[PDB]
Amino acid sequence: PQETLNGGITDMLTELANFEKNVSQAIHKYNAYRKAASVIAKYPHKIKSGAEAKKLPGVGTKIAEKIDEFLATGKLRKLEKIRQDDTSSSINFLTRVSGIGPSAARKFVDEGIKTLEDLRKNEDKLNHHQRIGLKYFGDFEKRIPREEMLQMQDIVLNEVKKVDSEYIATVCGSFRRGAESSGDMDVLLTHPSFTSESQPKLLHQVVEQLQKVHFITDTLSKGETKFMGVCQLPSKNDEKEYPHRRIDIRLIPKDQYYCGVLYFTGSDIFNKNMRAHALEKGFTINEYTIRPLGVTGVAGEPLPVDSEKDIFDYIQWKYREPKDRSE
DNA sequence: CCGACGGCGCATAGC
DNA sequence: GCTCATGCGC
DNA sequence: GTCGG
Length: 327
Ligand code: NA
Ligand code: NA
Ligand code: NA
Ligand code: NA
Hints:
Elements: H1 3-24, H2 27-41, H3 50-54, H4 61-73, H5 77-84, H6 86-94, H7 102-110, H8 116-121, H9 128-135, H10 137-140, E1 144-145, H11 146-163, E2 168-171, H12 173-176, E3 181-182, E4 185-190, H13 202-212, E5 216-222, E6 226-231, E7 245-251, H14 257-265, H15 268-280, E8 283-285, E9 290-292, H16 308-314
Parallel strand pairs: 4-7
Antiparallel strand pairs: 1-3, 2-4, 5-6, 6-7, 8-9
Helix pairs in contact: 1-2, 1-6, 1-7, 6-7, 11-13
The chain binds sodium ion (4 copies).
The site of one sodium ion has 3 residues, from loops.
It binds three DNA strands through helix 2, helix 4, helix 7 and strand 5.
């Protein structure tokens, strides 16, 4: 369905969502508004009334009422009011810096730190993550075209193999499902030496090599199993440089790797659907394992998994290609 | 009526 | 010095 | 804010 159908409604609900999550600190209302916006985005008719919307799951009495106001007047009084409120619009805005959540945004605005410029003058008050988020504010809000994702994957897979040819690495996310663009890069890493029953430098060696070839440019956080940072493709002699990009790398034990690859490939609705069907066949699937449920619901030991297909086989599903996992 | 709505790795008050 | 709740992002 | 036990 294109924007012209119900765009005004879904923009409104998304705006309301953000203020719940950044100003009111009401995460479940944020998700309620997002759920409503998405079920409306998939509705293939221009909505004529709130009552019509209320038949969709996730739209209830209050959003129906809102839609009625929006349809009759072309706006929402409460949203118009909050939009012009200097304090709340600043809190909302500051959370677009990665590392600034609702709490940090709230304290900054309470101190009169309201703009990107203000944060720039107050680096003393920013932790490491927030400084990186500030430095790359614009680049982090850009999407990554798939051709660049392919070039980034070339580097990651080459450097990983160079460190140890027994590493296994998979770029997941919507990119693995064929997406034409991405918001970041999500890399899943394992090694045969690393199981649930088994070194503390497996992740570090890969991060270090990616830094040595100057692909990784900054680190947001890094422990023994998860790295979150910044990377940039190299630019040619005269060309404009590429944007800095968000990259996460996680090291998963080999016996949980393909459950991990399944989960972080998605989509989210595909994941819900697969887990629902697994319950009906007597299995519980999470990020890490698939386990049988006993007749009284008691989970057994994780089942051995050596491919994504093994998981599909356990639950009597035909193997779905990543490109066919939109739901 | 009223609890659940995801859970966890990593960076950063309280004893 | 330590443990760990909280914030944050995903 | 919405859903459902
Ligand atoms: Na509904
Ligand atoms: Na944000
Ligand atoms: Na943020
Ligand atoms: Na090797």
